[PDB]
Amino acid sequence: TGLLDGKRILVSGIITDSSIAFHIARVAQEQGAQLVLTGFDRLRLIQRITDRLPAKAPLLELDVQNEEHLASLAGRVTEAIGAGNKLDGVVHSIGFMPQTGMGINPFFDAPYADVSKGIHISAYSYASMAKALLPIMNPGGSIVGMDFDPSRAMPAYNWMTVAKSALESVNRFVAREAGKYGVRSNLVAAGPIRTLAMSAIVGGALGEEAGAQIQLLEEGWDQRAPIGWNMKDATPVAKTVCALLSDWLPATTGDIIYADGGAHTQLL
Amino acid sequence: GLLDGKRILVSGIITDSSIAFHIARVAQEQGAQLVLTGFDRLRLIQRITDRLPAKAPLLELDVQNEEHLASLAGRVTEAIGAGNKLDGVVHSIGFMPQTGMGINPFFDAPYADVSKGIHISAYSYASMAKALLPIMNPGGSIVGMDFDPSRAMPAYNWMTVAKSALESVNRFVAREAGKYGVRSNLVAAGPIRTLAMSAIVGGALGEEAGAQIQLLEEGWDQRAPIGWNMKDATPVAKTVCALLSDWLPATTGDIIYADGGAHTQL
Amino acid sequence: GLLDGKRILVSGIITDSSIAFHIARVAQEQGAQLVLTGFDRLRLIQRITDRLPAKAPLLELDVQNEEHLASLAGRVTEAIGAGNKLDGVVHSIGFMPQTGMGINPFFDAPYADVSKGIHISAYSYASMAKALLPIMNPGGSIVGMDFDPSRAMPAYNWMTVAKSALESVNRFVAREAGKYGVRSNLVAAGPIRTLAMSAIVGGALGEEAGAQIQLLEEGWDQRAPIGWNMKDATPVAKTVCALLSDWLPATTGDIIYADGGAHTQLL
Amino acid sequence: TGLLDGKRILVSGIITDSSIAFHIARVAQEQGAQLVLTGFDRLRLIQRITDRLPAKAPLLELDVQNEEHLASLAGRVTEAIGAGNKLDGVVHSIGFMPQTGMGINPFFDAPYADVSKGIHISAYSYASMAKALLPIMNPGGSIVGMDFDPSRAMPAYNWMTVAKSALESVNRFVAREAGKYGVRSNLVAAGPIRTLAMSAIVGGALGEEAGAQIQLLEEGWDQRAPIGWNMKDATPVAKTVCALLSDWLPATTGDIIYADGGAHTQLL
Numbered sequence A, D: 001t002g003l004l005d006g007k008r009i010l011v012s013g014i015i016t017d018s019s020i021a022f023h024i025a026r027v028a029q030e031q032g033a034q035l036v037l038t039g040f041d042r043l044r045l046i047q048r049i050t051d052r053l054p055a056k057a058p059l060l061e062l063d064v065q066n067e068e069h070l071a072s073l074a075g076r077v078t079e080a081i082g083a084g085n086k087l088d089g090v091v092h093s094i095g096f097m098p099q100t101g102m103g104i105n106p107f108f109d110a111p112y113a114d115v116s117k118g119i120h121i122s123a124y125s126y127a128s129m130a131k132a133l134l135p136i137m138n139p140g141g142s143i144v145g146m147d148f149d150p151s152r153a154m155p156a157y158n159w160m161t162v163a164k165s166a167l168e169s170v171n172r173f174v175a176r177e178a179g180k181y182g183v184r185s186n187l188v189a190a191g192p193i194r195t196l197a198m199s200a201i202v203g204g205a206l207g208e209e210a211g212a213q214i215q216l217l218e219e220g221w222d223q224r225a226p227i228g229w230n231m232k233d234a235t236p237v238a239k240t241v242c243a244l245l246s247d248w249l250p251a252t253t254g255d256i257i258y259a260d261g262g263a264h265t266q267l268l
Numbered sequence B: 001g002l003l004d005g006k007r008i009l010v011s012g013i014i015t016d017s018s019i020a021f022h023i024a025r026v027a028q029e030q031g032a033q034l035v036l037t038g039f040d041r042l043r044l045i046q047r048i049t050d051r052l053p054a055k056a057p058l059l060e061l062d063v064q065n066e067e068h069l070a071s072l073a074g075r076v077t078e079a080i081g082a083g084n085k086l087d088g089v090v091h092s093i094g095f096m097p098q099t100g101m102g103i104n105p106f107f108d109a110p111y112a113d114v115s116k117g118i119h120i121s122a123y124s125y126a127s128m129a130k131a132l133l134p135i136m137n138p139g140g141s142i143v144g145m146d147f148d149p150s151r152a153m154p155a156y157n158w159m160t161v162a163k164s165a166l167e168s169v170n171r172f173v174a175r176e177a178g179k180y181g182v183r184s185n186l187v188a189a190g191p192i193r194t195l196a197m198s199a200i201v202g203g204a205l206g207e208e209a210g211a212q213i214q215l216l217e218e219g220w221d222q223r224a225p226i227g228w229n230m231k232d233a234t235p236v237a238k239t240v241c242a243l244l245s246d247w248l249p250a251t252t253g254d255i256i257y258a259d260g261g262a263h264t265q266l
Numbered sequence C: 001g002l003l004d005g006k007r008i009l010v011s012g013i014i015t016d017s018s019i020a021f022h023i024a025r026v027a028q029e030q031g032a033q034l035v036l037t038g039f040d041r042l043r044l045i046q047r048i049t050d051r052l053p054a055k056a057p058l059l060e061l062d063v064q065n066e067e068h069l070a071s072l073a074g075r076v077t078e079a080i081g082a083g084n085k086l087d088g089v090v091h092s093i094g095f096m097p098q099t100g101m102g103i104n105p106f107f108d109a110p111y112a113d114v115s116k117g118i119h120i121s122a123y124s125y126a127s128m129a130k131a132l133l134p135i136m137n138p139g140g141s142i143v144g145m146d147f148d149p150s151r152a153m154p155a156y157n158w159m160t161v162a163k164s165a166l167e168s169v170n171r172f173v174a175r176e177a178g179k180y181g182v183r184s185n186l187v188a189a190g191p192i193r194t195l196a197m198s199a200i201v202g203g204a205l206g207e208e209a210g211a212q213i214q215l216l217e218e219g220w221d222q223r224a225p226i227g228w229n230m231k232d233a234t235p236v237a238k239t240v241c242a243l244l245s246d247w248l249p250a251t252t253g254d255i256i257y258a259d260g261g262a263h264t265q266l267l
């Protein structure tokens, strides 16, 4: 009956009820999965959000820049799911880039310390989480990360585009490691969705250009997408992540699935 | 069932090893009601499809025959009932004359041979979509079979060119299908022992067929981080069923790789 | 001269706006000795090729005509003199019937029309390489013209499919050409005002031809970091001459984009 | 006469006479270019090596991680070429990755501080040099960087593959900035060449397998390449860089030219 019945899945990246990770968790629970959630920094606020999910799920703290949190993660997950049990899926829905690396801030003015922090959180941490969690994953398992197609340069995304290009490369090497465990590793390249990162990181960096730039982004995406695109609806993206967490894409690994309305395949 | 209540047309069954046979079997296991299409050997195809878990009507369809295409939607509507439409369409059809394959020199394939292969293998994806889109429901899905042609390779020769054209046709079919709320995608599969692999590819390789196919399988399984078994079409069938389902609703004009991850590695 | 001493065959001249006319002009300015091929209206084509800076023999070549292809190497050898070989070949040929283009419905193009377009626009790149590789020197270069078909777009319709096929053919021609020490590559150009743009692409757009080309050009120039001028074929002709030269000796089966960098960007 | 007659070009990345940058400089000088060279750390060795070039060229110190070197670079180059003169070309031929990020060292065991150093030198510095040098470049100018095709994961290249994926993305954004000055930015993806980085960095990280792994790489590359490939010959790569520095690829920017014998377009 449920697409993920009997599956134990770790979902990182919930910060608000608009987070892509919130919708992934909601859809996964609706489909029978038992979740373990991870949150960063504002744990009291995150628990208030995760209480809105269909079912209870333990929340563990994880700052991906914190070596101690990573070294303890597998043990804390095992305590949450019970000794002897393993995870079937892991969702990396994490990203960050300082303001200097985004929007109308000049591309050449982002200092390396800022870009490095963004690449650490947005790309290297996909390898860090796989390293910590592969030893407690079952064969047939699935690791999924979130991508924003960085094949071409574009306005505002700036250094986050470089971090996503690095993340696509990391995913191909993580697939080589995960294959030793019978585990798949893939990214879902989503179209634009109204989340806290889009408003607070992207929107805040666009300044007086946010209104026009985001309208043109939204309109162009919906126009290029042969089936349209609704930036207010994360459900099609959440369903796609759940398809990769399921047993229905068993031969796909080190790859990118586009949940973008088909926009990347069209010029206009 | 993943496809409960869905009405899906599946083309391309010729034997019980056909990729379409496994797609049809998995779709039926998942609750789909099928309409099947077959080319030329209707008596053999009926005997083969009697091995599927459930009954399904078999319609004749030669994609080079304009009359078959012009009458196809009406014949499908008769099989599924007036007022009912399809939710899914699977194109699992290919052909290339021997001159366009194997050890036969690339430059020696005459255009009449290449053209026949492009007609059946690439243009017909647009033909089947033209015939069936008027009888598809919104939220529907059209899926075609691909073999990654982004880089030249031994033996695949002109079939590589037909698949490159098929990928381009798929992106334009997605533009037309979107007007109906329908998705169009290809599944690029790794190598599977089928009649086309043995008769068409192996036939054109001559004395080197066994050795070249062994080298292809071993190399594919090595490159693929999760391995690859050419004797098992089930992972490819499951991937097609995922695209026919409501679980990839935002993917269109695209290519899903069901190849063990081989295309992403060296 | 970049091409001093080189003997190069250039197909595809029909008007003095043809991308092939500008490739031939820049190649002659750079010291190359040319052999030209033309289709159908050879008397008219000779009057156009008389506008080039230097004389060049003009040969008839309809790429759908097996007899023309079978005699081509002998006719080229007669034009350049026995004992000499070609260093370069330029394929700057394309055609698609109206049904396969513009506002005409993508599904209404009959296969006979699409097949004719694929024959002329893609298979012929393999035909010309088959006919001419036997009379090419090591270090030589075959160049074809492409229009980036990696993503679908309005109006280009079935010509996009033909260019996707041409890209795949080019990778296989590189395998054959490598046996002769010859490179094979395509140049994916941005939009240039030529007879095919006006008569074929524009012809199939009905009343929207002007609006569509102006919007295509504006968007292309905006997206291209160095800009794009659709009235100037010289940057494209120079790129083809770079591939015909000895300065890209390790590039084959590939695509070089002379499009202002538009394909690598979004606006 | 010369392909680069009258052009003033800065060339970074010479360490030995096998460096790709040494062959780029030699071919550029044979084609009439006037060079300014930059070197890192081993200036006494670099000066002796550059004395083997066909013509004299000033050598300037440049450590791309040193902010003071980058801030003074344009003034130092202007002093070398004369006030009132500007550069027509810039060649970035710089790369580094700590041993943990390469060879048989496990992908997951490379600490972020090591990956970050490698990404700083190998990818971010392409944007650093463009920021420093664009104010002193003429319209019609050209910036070229060196790439190794990272579109697919492969043995041994490990985190350097991630740095090159990031560099390709950086190049597309440097093209947007360089276009404001009428300057092109592109990468050359070269096949394998026996250089100090190949022997000391890649070979060093392969341990006891260095000889066999490099032999298989060379043999396979030459087999896949329709026109073949010679790892002992950097001249085809140097000529390709000179073609991009010339006026003969005037409409190509934010792009990647493959000087790899055509290997990337084939399977065998």
Ligand SMILES: NC(=O)c1ccc[n+]([C@@H]2O[C@H](COP(=O)([O-])OP(=O)(O)OC[C@H]3O[C@@H](n4cnc5c(N)ncnc54)[C@H](O)[C@@H]3O)[C@@H](O)[C@H]2O)c1
Binding pocket: A012, A013, A014, A015, A016, A018, A019, A020, A021, A039, A040, A062, A063, A064, A065, A092, A093, A094, A095, A096, A121, A146, A147, A148, A189, A190, A191, A192, A193, A194, A195, A196, A197, A198
């Ligand atoms: N919203 C979009 O349009 C969109 C599109 C494509 C891809 N994505 C990607 O989806 C993912 C989720 O982003 P979102 O849009 O849902 O925004 P969001 O703000 O809801 O989520 C971003 C998450 O990253 C977490 N994070 C930041 N630093 C962290 C750290 N040190 N350790 C652990 N977690 C950390 C934040 O706490 C937050 O939960 C990101 O990878 C983003 O790049 C988003």
Ligand SMILES: NC(=O)c1ccc[n+]([C@@H]2O[C@H](COP(=O)([O-])OP(=O)(O)OC[C@H]3O[C@@H](n4cnc5c(N)ncnc54)[C@H](O)[C@@H]3O)[C@@H](O)[C@H]2O)c1
Binding pocket: B011, B012, B013, B014, B015, B017, B018, B019, B020, B038, B039, B061, B062, B063, B064, B091, B092, B093, B094, B095, B120, B145, B146, B147, B188, B189, B190, B191, B192, B193, B194, B195, B196, B197
């Ligand atoms: N077998 C593989 O390794 C493999 C891998 C990737 C993709 N594919 C693709 O999968 C598809 C199915 O091939 P397969 O391997 O299952 O082989 P198969 O021989 O089982 O199927 C090929 C089918 O094409 C049909 N066909 C041929 N001419 C036709 C026509 N005129 N009208 C209608 N149908 C026609 C045949 O009747 C047959 O059913 C093809 O598109 C093939 O290129 C196969």
Ligand SMILES: NC(=O)c1ccc[n+]([C@@H]2O[C@H](COP(=O)([O-])OP(=O)(O)OC[C@H]3O[C@@H](n4cnc5c(N)ncnc54)[C@H](O)[C@@H]3O)[C@@H](O)[C@H]2O)c1
Binding pocket: C011, C012, C013, C014, C015, C017, C018, C019, C020, C038, C039, C061, C062, C063, C064, C091, C092, C093, C094, C095, C120, C145, C146, C147, C188, C189, C190, C191, C192, C193, C194, C195, C196, C197
């Ligand atoms: N104009 C553009 O914007 C543009 C952009 C990118 C690529 N291209 C490509 O450049 C090439 C040249 O086109 P153009 O734009 O210069 O237009 P054009 O009309 O000047 O040239 C097209 C040429 O194809 C020739 N041709 C047609 N059928 C032929 C046949 N049977 N045999 C031999 N030659 C035949 C015509 O005679 C003509 O010389 C084509 O491949 C085209 O697709 C054009």
Ligand SMILES: NC(=O)c1ccc[n+]([C@@H]2O[C@H](COP(=O)([O-])OP(=O)(O)OC[C@H]3O[C@@H](n4cnc5c(N)ncnc54)[C@H](O)[C@@H]3O)[C@@H](O)[C@H]2O)c1
Binding pocket: D012, D013, D014, D015, D016, D018, D019, D020, D021, D039, D040, D062, D063, D064, D065, D093, D094, D095, D096, D121, D146, D147, D148, D189, D190, D191, D192, D193, D194, D195, D196, D197, D198
């Ligand atoms: N050798 C190959 O097979 C090959 C193939 C493709 C691409 N490449 C690329 O070509 C470029 C040149 O490498 P190579 O193979 O000639 O090796 P090399 O060892 O000759 O050159 C590497 C250079 O990087 C310089 N460098 C390192 N850290 C630096 C810093 N902090 N500041 C400034 N310069 C610094 C070194 O001083 C050296 O000159 C690199 O980007 C490399 O990745 C090499």
Ligand SMILES: O=C(NCc1cn(Cc2ccc(Oc3ccccc3)c(O)c2)nn1)c1cc2ccccc2oc1=O
Binding pocket: A094, A095, A096, A097, A147, A148, A154, A155, A156, A157, A160, A191, A192, A193, A195, A197, A198, A201, A202, A213, A214, A216, A217, A220, C266, C267
């Ligand atoms: O990327 C663009 N603008 C910025 C942008 C991207 N997005 C989507 C998104 C939101 C939040 C994300 O999460 C994050 C987390 C942490 C840190 C930074 C982002 C994220 O990864 C992606 N929303 N706004 C544009 C692209 C574009 C493409 C085609 C044509 C025109 C275009 O115009 C644009 O403005």
Ligand SMILES: O=C(NCc1cn(Cc2ccc(Oc3ccccc3)c(O)c2)nn1)c1cc2ccccc2oc1=O
Binding pocket: B093, B094, B095, B096, B146, B147, B153, B154, B155, B156, B159, B190, B191, B192, B194, B196, B197, B200, B201, B212, B216, B219, D267, D268
């Ligand atoms: O493609 C290759 N060889 C030929 C080949 C392809 N296949 C898979 C297949 C079977 C039948 C197919 O169906 C059809 C139907 C109708 C008409 C032609 C084929 C089909 O499309 C694809 N099996 N053998 C090779 C690729 C390769 C890649 C990497 C390294 C080495 C390689 O070596 C190869 O030999």
Ligand SMILES: O=C(NCc1cn(Cc2ccc(Oc3ccccc3)c(O)c2)nn1)c1cc2ccccc2oc1=O
Binding pocket: A267, A268, C093, C094, C095, C096, C146, C147, C153, C154, C155, C156, C159, C190, C191, C192, C194, C196, C197, C200, C201, C212, C213, C215, C216, C219
């Ligand atoms: O009208 C459009 N596209 C059609 C097109 C293509 N070209 C360039 C070209 C010319 C002649 C060619 O030569 C040939 C020769 C023989 C046979 C067909 C074409 C050729 O290959 C390519 N010019 N117009 C578009 C309108 C648009 C408006 C706004 C934003 C984006 C857009 O994108 C479009 O692509």
Ligand SMILES: O=C(NCc1cn(Cc2ccc(Oc3ccccc3)c(O)c2)nn1)c1cc2ccccc2oc1=O
Binding pocket: B266, D094, D095, D096, D097, D147, D148, D154, D155, D156, D157, D160, D191, D192, D193, D195, D197, D198, D201, D202, D213, D217, D220
């Ligand atoms: O990448 C590979 N091995 C490692 C490798 C790469 N290269 C070429 C190179 C040398 C030095 C470089 O400069 C640098 C500078 C600073 C820091 C690291 C490297 C560089 O960027 C690239 N030589 N050995 C392989 C690729 C591969 C592809 C197809 C089939 C099999 C394969 O097997 C391989 O072993």
Ligand code: NA
Binding pocket: A221, A222, A223, A224, A225, A226, A227, A228, A229
């Ligand atoms: Na749309």
Ligand code: NA
Binding pocket: B221, B222, B223, B224, B225, B226, B227
């Ligand atoms: Na494997």
Ligand code: NA
Binding pocket: B087, B139, B140, B141, B243, B244, B245, B246, B247
């Ligand atoms: Na569906």
Ligand code: NA
Binding pocket: C221, C222, C223, C224, C225, C226, C227, C228
């Ligand atoms: Na522009």
Ligand code: NA
Binding pocket: D222, D223, D224, D225, D226, D227, D228, D229
């Ligand atoms: Na070779």
